Amino acid sequence: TAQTVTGAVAAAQLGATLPHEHVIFGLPGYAGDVTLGPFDHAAALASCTETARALLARGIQTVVDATPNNCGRNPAFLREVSEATGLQILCATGFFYEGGGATTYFKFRASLGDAESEIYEMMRTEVTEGIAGTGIRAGVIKLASSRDAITPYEQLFFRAAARVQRETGVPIITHTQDGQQGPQQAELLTSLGADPARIMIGHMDGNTDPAYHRETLRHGVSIAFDRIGLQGMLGTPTDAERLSVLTTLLGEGYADRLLLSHDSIWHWLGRPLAIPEAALPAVKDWHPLHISDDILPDLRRRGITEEQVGQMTVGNPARLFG
């Protein structure tokens, strides 16, 4: 079964799934901006339930919320959104690339003792028992790595996650930075005995060389083109380039290892931030209805079959998260 924020759910009840999205999200530091950018709970609930309804209208029955522990993750809010709409939501346990922000805590602990075991205990507890005393369990572990390497600090989390994966069977989803380190993540996690049929290497659409994807897929893992709609921001490809690589890989029989998502943020934490005019095109399709309305029909137009589409959007998530 999949562990969702409203309880366990049968694999066959997951339905069409978006496997990497952010219902709410804050970059590390947002909490320090609380005076002028506090959480507007009513406004967030309204906006997020509206979005959940739009997804349910499109046949989407489950979303995997990939928000790390230090980026504003809020299981009780996700449960409110789920209970209000019927949309099934899985949440994550993990911390963001370091790299990234809010890293000083476990880096310091690592310097003074066995941080891997501490991380392992957090992950295990949040997967098996619950988060922050609420009884809401994480349904996926979230890992992230930097662009130029999986750093020794980041590896603490990879080794702790592999251990929890061996003991519980929990799925693992990842973040890759600027289209790098996919093969290394897959190789590291598999070498540690993690189950490749429960690993989704993320942000693989960030690289436009099919050979990079094929190398990752070699480890038996799945890969997600999960920032679909985010176009030419800070090195991201366009969707057209994404789909060009995807059609190639589909044509090589990889449909049962490919997944699709947006990495969208439905409500931003902190003060609202205005998108500069020049950047509007990059973010225009970066929202969770884009795959349903624009992408899937475009793949069908291209000769991708209904069976293949259902494999990416329903078959694979059932197997990976269920």
Residues forming the annotated binding site for Zn(2+)?
Answer: 20, 22, 142, 175, 203, 263
Of residues 73, 124, 137, 175, which one binds Co ion by CB under 5 A? 175
- Chain residue at closest Cβ approach to Co ion: 175
Asked if 186 interacts with Co ion (CB under 5 A), we say: no
Does 140 contact Co ion by CB under 5 A? Answer: no
Q: CA–CA separation, 106 vs 234, rounded Å? A: 28
14, 61 contact by CB (below 8 A): yes
Give the residue with the Cβ less far from Co ion, 144 or 258.
144
Q: Is 290 in the site for Co ion (CB under 5 A)?
A: no
Q: In angstroms, rounded to a whole number, what is the distance separating the alpha carbons of residues 25 and 261?
A: 16
Cβ 64 vs Cβ 93: under 8 Å:
no
Tell me how far apart the alpha carbons of residues 318 and 210 are, in angstroms, rounded to a whole number: 25
Segment lying near Co ion (by CB under 5 A), choices 34-42, 120-128, 129-137, 261-269? 261-269
Give the nearest distance from C-beta 11 to Co ion in angstroms.
23
Residue 15 zone, left/alpha/beta (φ > 0; ψ -120 to 50; rest): left
- Asked if 312 interacts with Co ion (CB under 5 A), we say no
Q: Residues 53-92: x/- map of binding to Co ion (CB under 5 A)?
A: -------------x--------------------------
Residue 263 in contact with Co ion, rule: CB under 5 A: yes
Nearer to Co ion, 203 or 304 (CB): 203
Residue 285 near Co ion by CB under 5 A: no
Where does this chain touch Co ion (CB under 5 A) — which range of 45-53, 81-89, 149-157, 255-263? 255-263
Q: Of 179, 199, 177, 202, which is closest to residue 190 (Cα–Cα)?
A: 199
The site that binds Co ion (CB under 5 A) totals a number of residues, namely 3
Contacting range for Co ion; rule: CB under 5 A; set: 85-93, 118-126, 170-178, 249-257: 170-178
Q: Residue 265 or residue 304: which is nearer to Co ion going by CB? A: 265
Output 203 or 213, the one with its CB closest to Co ion: 203
Residue placing its CB nearer to Co ion in the complex, 23 or 309? 23
Q: Which residues are annotated as a binding site?
A: 20, 22, 142, 175, 203, 263
Q: Candidates 56-64, 260-268, 290-298, 301-309 — which segment interacts with Co ion by CB under 5 A?
A: 260-268
What's the rounded Cα separation, in Å, for the pair 285 and 288?
8
Residue 176 has which token pair? Answer: 């890759």
- Closer residue to Co ion, CB minimum distance, 205 or 263: 263
- Which of the stretches 128-136, 169-177, 241-249, 277-285 binds Co ion when contact is defined by CB under 5 A? 169-177
Nearest approach, Cβ of residue 226 and Co ion (Å): 7
Would you tell me which residues interact with Co ion (CB under 5 A)? 66, 175, 263
